[PDB]
Design an enzyme around this catalytic site. Structure first.
Site, PDB file in Angstrom:
ATOM      1  N   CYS B 119       0.819  -1.217   0.000  1.00 46.49           N
ATOM      2  CA  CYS B 119       0.000   0.000   0.000  1.00 46.49           C
ATOM      3  C   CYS B 119       0.849   1.261   0.000  1.00 46.49           C
ATOM      4  O   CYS B 119       1.677   1.469   0.897  1.00 46.49           O
ATOM      5  CB  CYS B 119      -0.946   0.026   1.215  1.00 46.49           C
ATOM      6  N   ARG B 122      -0.282   4.502   2.698  1.00 44.83           N
ATOM      7  CA  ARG B 122      -0.097   4.356   4.135  1.00 44.83           C
ATOM      8  C   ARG B 122       0.246   5.566   4.990  1.00 44.83           C
ATOM      9  O   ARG B 122       0.386   5.425   6.200  1.00 44.83           O
ATOM     10  CB  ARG B 122       0.937   3.279   4.413  1.00 44.83           C
ATOM     11  N   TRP B 291      -9.364   6.177  -0.703  1.00 41.03           N
ATOM     12  CA  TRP B 291      -9.629   6.866  -1.965  1.00 41.03           C
ATOM     13  C   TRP B 291      -8.649   6.402  -3.043  1.00 41.03           C
ATOM     14  O   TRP B 291      -7.602   5.832  -2.744  1.00 41.03           O
ATOM     15  CB  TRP B 291      -9.616   8.387  -1.792  1.00 41.03           C
ATOM     16  N   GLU B 296      -4.995   3.724 -10.886  1.00 39.71           N
ATOM     17  CA  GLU B 296      -5.789   2.520 -10.640  1.00 39.71           C
ATOM     18  C   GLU B 296      -6.900   2.360 -11.668  1.00 39.71           C
ATOM     19  O   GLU B 296      -7.171   1.259 -12.138  1.00 39.71           O
ATOM     20  CB  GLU B 296      -6.383   2.564  -9.233  1.00 39.71           C
TER      21      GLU B 296
HETATM   22  C1  HEM Z   1      -6.152   6.672   1.801  1.00 37.51           C
HETATM   23  C2  HEM Z   1      -6.410   6.048   0.596  1.00 37.51           C
HETATM   24  C3  HEM Z   1      -5.666   4.983   0.094  1.00 37.51           C
HETATM   25  C4  HEM Z   1      -4.853   4.989  -1.024  1.00 37.51           C
HETATM   26  C5  HEM Z   1      -4.707   6.122  -2.014  1.00 37.51           C
HETATM   27  C6  HEM Z   1      -4.220   3.671  -1.160  1.00 37.51           C
HETATM   28  C7  HEM Z   1      -3.614   3.241  -2.322  1.00 37.51           C
HETATM   29  C8  HEM Z   1      -3.420   1.932  -2.698  1.00 37.51           C
HETATM   30  C9  HEM Z   1      -3.081   1.476  -4.026  1.00 37.51           C
HETATM   31  C10 HEM Z   1      -2.719   2.345  -5.239  1.00 37.51           C
HETATM   32  C11 HEM Z   1      -3.104   0.125  -3.980  1.00 37.51           C
HETATM   33  C12 HEM Z   1      -2.970  -0.774  -5.192  1.00 37.51           C
HETATM   34  C13 HEM Z   1      -4.146  -1.674  -5.525  1.00 37.51           C
HETATM   35  C14 HEM Z   1      -3.985  -2.346  -6.871  1.00 37.51           C
HETATM   36  O1  HEM Z   1      -2.990  -2.046  -7.561  1.00 37.51           O
HETATM   37  O2  HEM Z   1      -4.851  -3.163  -7.254  1.00 37.51           O
HETATM   38  C15 HEM Z   1      -3.405  -0.261  -2.616  1.00 37.51           C
HETATM   39  C16 HEM Z   1      -3.392  -1.554  -2.108  1.00 37.51           C
HETATM   40  C17 HEM Z   1      -3.569  -1.901  -0.778  1.00 37.51           C
HETATM   41  N1  HEM Z   1      -3.872  -0.957   0.250  1.00 37.51           N
HETATM   42 FE1  HEM Z   1      -4.042   0.990   0.161  1.00 37.51          FE
HETATM   43  N2  HEM Z   1      -4.648   2.824  -0.135  1.00 37.51           N
HETATM   44  C18 HEM Z   1      -5.574   3.609   0.612  1.00 37.51           C
HETATM   45  C19 HEM Z   1      -6.318   3.164   1.712  1.00 37.51           C
HETATM   46  C20 HEM Z   1      -6.246   1.912   2.302  1.00 37.51           C
HETATM   47  C21 HEM Z   1      -6.957   1.479   3.517  1.00 37.51           C
HETATM   48  C22 HEM Z   1      -7.972   2.227   4.403  1.00 37.51           C
HETATM   49  C23 HEM Z   1      -6.464   0.234   3.772  1.00 37.51           C
HETATM   50  C24 HEM Z   1      -6.850  -0.618   4.816  1.00 37.51           C
HETATM   51  C25 HEM Z   1      -7.031  -0.270   6.131  1.00 37.51           C
HETATM   52  C26 HEM Z   1      -5.484  -0.085   2.712  1.00 37.51           C
HETATM   53  C27 HEM Z   1      -4.809  -1.292   2.511  1.00 37.51           C
HETATM   54  C28 HEM Z   1      -4.071  -1.737   1.389  1.00 37.51           C
HETATM   55  C29 HEM Z   1      -3.835  -3.180   1.109  1.00 37.51           C
HETATM   56  C30 HEM Z   1      -4.107  -4.318   2.116  1.00 37.51           C
HETATM   57  C31 HEM Z   1      -3.489  -3.275  -0.237  1.00 37.51           C
HETATM   58  C32 HEM Z   1      -3.097  -4.552  -0.977  1.00 37.51           C
HETATM   59  C33 HEM Z   1      -4.063  -4.870  -2.108  1.00 37.51           C
HETATM   60  C34 HEM Z   1      -3.882  -6.263  -2.652  1.00 37.51           C
HETATM   61  O3  HEM Z   1      -3.034  -6.997  -2.103  1.00 37.51           O
HETATM   62  O4  HEM Z   1      -4.590  -6.623  -3.618  1.00 37.51           O
HETATM   63  N3  HEM Z   1      -5.368   0.932   1.839  1.00 37.51           N
HETATM   64  N4  HEM Z   1      -3.622   0.862  -1.843  1.00 37.51           N
HETATM   65  N1  LIG Z   2      -6.880   3.224  -3.273  1.00 38.72           N
HETATM   66  C1  LIG Z   2      -7.261   2.025  -2.854  1.00 38.72           C
HETATM   67  N2  LIG Z   2      -7.469   1.815  -1.558  1.00 38.72           N
HETATM   68  N3  LIG Z   2      -7.421   1.044  -3.735  1.00 38.72           N
HETATM   69  C2  LIG Z   2      -7.826  -0.314  -3.398  1.00 38.72           C
HETATM   70  C3  LIG Z   2      -7.825  -1.202  -4.622  1.00 38.72           C
HETATM   71  C4  LIG Z   2      -8.612  -0.605  -5.782  1.00 38.72           C
HETATM   72  C5  LIG Z   2      -8.376  -1.350  -7.104  1.00 38.72           C
HETATM   73  N4  LIG Z   2      -6.929  -1.289  -7.456  1.00 38.72           N
HETATM   74  C6  LIG Z   2      -9.230  -0.760  -8.227  1.00 38.72           C
HETATM   75  O1  LIG Z   2      -8.687   0.037  -9.022  1.00 38.72           O
HETATM   76  O2  LIG Z   2     -10.425  -1.114  -8.308  1.00 38.72           O
END
Ligand code: HEM
Ligand SMILES: NC(=[NH2+])NCCC[C@H](N)C(=O)O
Ligand code: HEM
Ligand SMILES: C[C@H](O)[C@H](O)[C@H]1CNc2nc(N)[nH]c(=O)c2N1
Ligand SMILES: C[C@H](O)[C@H](O)[C@H]1CNc2nc(N)[nH]c(=O)c2N1
Ligand SMILES: NC(=[NH2+])NCCC[C@H](N)C(=O)O
Ligand SMILES: [Zn+2]
Lengths: 420, 420
Positions: B119, B122, B291, B296
């Site tokens: 992520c 974070r 968000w 994405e």
């Molecule tokens: C504040 C907004 C957030 C942004 C902009 C962000 C951004 C991202 C992005 C760009 C990915 C890539 C997903 C993909 O490529 O399919 C991701 C994955 C992930 N994020 Fe964040 N995130 C956010 C909020 C959260 C929240 C609230 C959580 C959980 C408490 C979280 C947990 C993770 C995890 C567990 C992944 C791994 C996804 C996977 O393994 O398929 N994120 N996030």
């Molecule tokens: N910013 C995030 N928390 N993304 C969570 C995964 C979203 C996913 N990669 C999508 O484009 O549908």
């Protein structure tokens, strides 16, 4: 199962089995609880300034290589095989080393390229021109061998892949080293205004050169002089004949103002600061070359913040709102630059490959390597282009990375080890 | 030091020392001879099925979490700490499990996000709204809880990060599962004449929904029904009040033909198929949301060949030289497209972040974490954007990936194991 590792492409759902990894010997830096897969140099062979292979360590390495060699030509265990094994076996006892036959050199060289996980052009691995230079003994002999290489590979624009191998290392007898990072590369100067003229990546080297007599023109694209070292002696400067350094003036197929930026780059990418390793032997000098993939120049050399970093000025000329990063103006300019690069090289008839086709061919290479060899070590981090990654097939390709020999390794900068 | 792993940034030459990796105990999937850092599902602690933990396996895990939890609040080895440990230890042997106080649940939710190596967002980890739905007992109850999440989180377009945690896993009562990969997503239909209408990534799920009674609009952007499962019971369908699903029509700030491409996406990305693990406890249903990062949708969702694959159509419209890929029409189309996406959101006051702002933020986050925490597990392969990677600061940054607890894990598809 536990040995039959699998690799799948999430775009085409094709799954391949990797068994070649088992023949791996060296370590990747990754442990059971941590992954160093993004660490540039795990130092698992940045060849520190210490001893070298022992008569002991050396034979097993030779045995493995020799055995590899005979399996390939379909003569495994044959008398000929046993013969060279005892021969090499004896050669080491007496000389504390050995020499490779020409057939064994070409093979190992082509295989150090076939096992180069960070290379995306390995589909060309079998077409390599080897230049045995083990007979060289001086910096002038080296320069002659190099000029011959630059000329053979540049081939008037129709680039050809080639590598020149100078005398293997000995021990306290000293060795050969091309002090340049690449045969052809522009100079870099630190301006009084704290700024920097030319290529910032070669700033210290250039100071070594000017410090050794080189008369720096103080320009943006000044081709550096060769700083060759032989037999373990002080390096000697050598300017490459200009008619031998092919260059391409960069211009856009739409923006007449592009030429106005004063951009140019060289045709032949020839890495010269690595160490070729075959059968336990260390070849401290083995400059090799092929041809460029657009992005190398366009994305990395031109736009890297640390390199020329031309994105800003290129954005201005396009009249883009550079106020908010949300405009994606850096992205917009970047696609224009690289369109210019492939356009020029193609117009000047110099060889080059764009990232789309380069990555696609590499996917076929991978399908080949699994088919006939049962694997293909690949460094995902390095293999994926530094632009438009997602739209290239290798982004969805799962790659397994392991270290196989013969191989190309990094080594210290000669000026952090050379005494006097 | 010789155990104080150092990571470096090859743009600022900043070197950080990671001591935190010492607190990981779980497998990465790599060894000394191989690296599987580019493998999607590196089957090395995913989440085994059949039965579950055990008195033996559980307490030590619960103990680790608590000592950790009490250190955060600064009460390690205190009365509350000691007493709390024994209550748990006692409650485990008797009830063969245990419950987390409301404070320990919020600490676990937040820190499972803080440890999410894949992520990039974070930096927000601490700012998280945790919704405790451990009292839920039926699908209708789950839907009410989900609905309340979507609304809190959406906040009229001023998104807020939240997570709804349903009842933990037991053994026989059985799991609470959200059969939907994401709370809000579009359906996919594979037409008899080869084609696919709508998202091709949701074709399998859509067929389940249709088989469970859902009446399909059979369109390009049909929001899919929630398919919820409570206490191991068969899943039941639930439509999400349209007024609760914020959508954004995609248009371009210069190209007016973009409007006619017919694109729109939902502003709330809520992953609902992962397993949150805390103190040995497994929460099979824990939808979380924040968000979107422009790429994405702009690169992955719209441009992937296995998704909406819209590069051609946009290119023709832009009328690029689609004859040879060296024209980089695909690269040109991909940029305008992502500009259109970030444009549409910001115009509709819907929260979203561009890959430039995101990575710049993940960097400052990393550095802060190294300062206070002593490390920051990160996955280079996922952290670097799917476009313009090298012009983003994360590309030139080395990252140590390792497994910390609490965490979010992948879990098998509910339909490949749900009995009857
Ligand atoms: C504040 C907004 C957030 C942004 C902009 C962000 C951004 C991202 C992005 C760009 C990915 C890539 C997903 C993909 O490529 O399919 C991701 C994955 C992930 N994020 Fe964040 N995130 C956010 C909020 C959260 C929240 C609230 C959580 C959980 C408490 C979280 C947990 C993770 C995890 C567990 C992944 C791994 C996804 C996977 O393994 O398929 N994120 N996030
Ligand atoms: N910013 C995030 N928390 N993304 C969570 C995964 C979203 C996913 N990669 C999508 O484009 O549908
Ligand atoms: C067919 C032409 C070739 C193409 C298209 C090609 C392309 C590439 C690319 C894109 C990289 C990335 C370099 C960087 O980002 O710094 C690379 C690296 C590399 N290639 Fe190839 N390559 C070719 C020929 C060769 C040859 C002839 C050899 C040697 C026999 C070779 C050995 C390697 C090695 C060892 C690296 C590692 C560079 C490093 O560690 O800095 N390549 N190549
Ligand atoms: C830190 C990270 O390993 C480093 O920036 C890598 C990433 N991928 C790369 N890939 C290629 N082809 N070339 C490079 O120089 C790099 N740099
Ligand atoms: C095979 C490879 O690991 C896979 O395609 C990865 C690469 N990096 C990624 N990075 C992000 N953020 N999301 C992804 O889905 C992927 N896919
Ligand atoms: N295609 C190659 N063999 N490249 C070797 C490295 C060239 C270097 N990355 C450059 O662009 O200057
Ligand atoms: Zn690894």
């Amino acid at each position: 199962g536990p040995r039959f590792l699998k690799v799948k492409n999430w775009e085409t759902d094709v799954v391949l089995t990797d068994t070649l990894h088992l023949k791996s010997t060296l370590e990747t830096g990754c442990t059971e609880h941590i992954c160093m897969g993004s660490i540039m140099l795990p130092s698992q062979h940045t060849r520190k300034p210490e001893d070298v292979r022992t008569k002991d360590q050396l034979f097993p390495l030779a045995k493995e290589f020799l055995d590899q060699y005979y399996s390939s030509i379909k003569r495994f265990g044959s008398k000929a095989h046993m013969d060279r094994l005892e021969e090499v076996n004896k050669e080491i006892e007496s000389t504390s080393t050995y020499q490779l036959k020409d057939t064994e050199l070409i093979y190992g060289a082509k295989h150090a390229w076939r096992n180069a996980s960070r290379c995306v052009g390995r589909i060309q691995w079998s077409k390599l021109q080897v230049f045995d230079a083990r007979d060289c003994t001086t910096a002038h002999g080296m320069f002659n061998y190099i000029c011959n290489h630059v000329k053979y590979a540049t081939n008037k624009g129709n680039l050809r892949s080639a590598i020149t191998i100078f005398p293997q290392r000995t021990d306290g007898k000293h060795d050969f080293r091309v002090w340049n990072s690449q045969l052809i590369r522009y100079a870099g100067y630190k301006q009084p205004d704290g700024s920097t003229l030319g290529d910032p990546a070669n700033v210290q080297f250039t100071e070594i050169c000017i410090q050794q007599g080189w008369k720096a023109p103080r320009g943006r694209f000044d081709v550096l002089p060769l700083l060759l070292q032989a037999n373990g002696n002080d390096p000697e400067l050598f300017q490459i004949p200009p008619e031998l350094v092919l260059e391409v003036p960069i211009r856009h197929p739409k923006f007449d103002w592009f030429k106005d930026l004063g951009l140019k780059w060289y045709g032949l990418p020839a890495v010269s600061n690595m160490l070729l390793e075959i059968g336990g032997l260390e070849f401290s000098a083995c400059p090799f070359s092929g041809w460029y993939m657009g992005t190398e120049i366009g994305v990395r050399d031109y736009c890297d913040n640390s390199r020329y970093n031309i994105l800003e000025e290129v954005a201005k000329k396009m009249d883009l709102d550079m106020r908010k990063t949300s405009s994606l103006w850096k992205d917009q300019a970047l696609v224009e630059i690289n369109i210019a690069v492939l356009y020029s090289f193609q117009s000047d008839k110099v060889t080059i490959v764009d990232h789309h086709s380069a990555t696609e061919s590499f996917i076929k290479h991978m399908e080949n390597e699994y088919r006939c060899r049962g694997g293909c070590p690949a460094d995902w981090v390095w293999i994926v282009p530094p632009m438009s990654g997602s739209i290239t097939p290798v982004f969805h390709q799962e790659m397994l990375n392991y270290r196989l020999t013969p191989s190309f390794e990094y080594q210290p900068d000669p000026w952090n080890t050379h005494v006097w």
